[PDB]
Amino acid sequence: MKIAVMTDSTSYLSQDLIDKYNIQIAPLSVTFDDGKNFTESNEIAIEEFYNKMASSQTIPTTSQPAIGEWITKYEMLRDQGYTDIIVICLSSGISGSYQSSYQAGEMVEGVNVHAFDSKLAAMIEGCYVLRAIEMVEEGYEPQQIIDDLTNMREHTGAYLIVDDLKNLQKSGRITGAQAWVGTLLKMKPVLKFEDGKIIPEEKVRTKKRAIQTLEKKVLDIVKDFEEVTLFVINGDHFEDGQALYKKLQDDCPSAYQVAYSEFGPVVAAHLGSGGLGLGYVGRKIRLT
Numbered sequence: 619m620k621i622a623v624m625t626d627s628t629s630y631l632s633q634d635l636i637d638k639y640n641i642q643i644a645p646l647s648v649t650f651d652d653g654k655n656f657t658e659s660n661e662i663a664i665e666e667f668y669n670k671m672a673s674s675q676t677i678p679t680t681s682q683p684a685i686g687e688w689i690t691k692y693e694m695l696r697d698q699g700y701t702d703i704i705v706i707c708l709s710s711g712i713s714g715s716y717q718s719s720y721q722a723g724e725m726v727e728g729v730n731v732h733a734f735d736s737k738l739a740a741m742i743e744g745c746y747v748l749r750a751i752e753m754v755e756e757g758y759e760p761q762q763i764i765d766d767l768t769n770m771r772e773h774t775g776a777y778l779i780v781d782d783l784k785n786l787q788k789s790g791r792i793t794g795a796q797a798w799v800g801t802l803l804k805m806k807p808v809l810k811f812e813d814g815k816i817i818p819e820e821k822v823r824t825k826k827r828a829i830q831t832l833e834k835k836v837l838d839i840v841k842d843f844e845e846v847t848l849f850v851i852n853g854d855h856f857e858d859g860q861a862l863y864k865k866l867q868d869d870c871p872s873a874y875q876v877a878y879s880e881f882g883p884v885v886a887a888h889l890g891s892g893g894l895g896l897g898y899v900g901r902k903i904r905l906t
């Protein structure tokens with residue numbers, strides 16, 4: 619038995635970790651109104667993506683990996699000698715990536731594919747990859763890993779803010795948010811993931827109070843966990859995520875793991891400018 623762990627690009631793992639563990643990635647893409655298509659990777663300058671989105675008369679669209687991209691990656695790993703492939707996917711509630719990766723796995727001969735629905739995105743999805751890799755090194759078998767990731771999923775989540783719901787409304791990735799869209803004053807929406815979908819949580823009077831609300835909501839949840847990893851997941855306002863990261867480092871005991879990450883282009887296209895997430899996992903994830 620020889621187990622590989624792979625993922626799609628929206629896990630937004632650092633290039634350092636992708637390099638160290640040779641993590642294969644099925645990339646998603648974003649298409650601009652001028653017909654320019656860009657596949658996700660860590661060579662794309664995120665600042666350049668935000669500049670093009672700002673200069674776009676129409677919001678860019680995104681695309682999951684094609685089923686043939688999964689198949690090509692599975693065939694490559696099989697032919698290097700892997701017998702089993704763990705696949706960590708973006709939430710099935712917001713993308714067809716997961717179901718595609720499962721159907722691709724059914725079609726590929728000579729290798730076992732174990733597709734896993736993270737029910738989240740960004741480095742929270744990425745934590746499932748890092749957990750799976752750790753378990754493979756410890757000698758676990760694929761079904762034990764899948765069982766452990768399924769348990770991890772029960773104590774994982776995220777809250778987030780955006781400047782405006784127009785990007786999420788345009789793509790249909792905000793669930794049950796009709797009355798707020800285009801009806802906000804200074805008030806800022808706080809959103810959260812629930813069972814793989816993005817739903818409203820609270821409306822707050824200002825952005826600064828919304829960032830305070832992210833911290834309060836998450837700290838109230840994770841105080842009941844035996845282990846805690848928090849991720850600040852920042853969008854285009856560097857100082858917003860950096861401020862929250864530093865405040866978490868002050869407010870939290872060192873027994874909590876507190877880390878910083880950023881959204882890539884595909885998630886940015888759906889959030890728009892001003893996105894900022896606080897994610898949590900009730901595990902001590904190996905981040906090195």
Ligand SMILES: CCCCCCCCCCCCCC(=O)O
Nearest residue numbers: 680681682713714739776888895
């Ligand atoms: C804190 C994590 C926040 C993640 C925000 C995710 C916003 C929705 C992204 C949807 C990507 C769909 C990709 C596709 O299938 O085309």
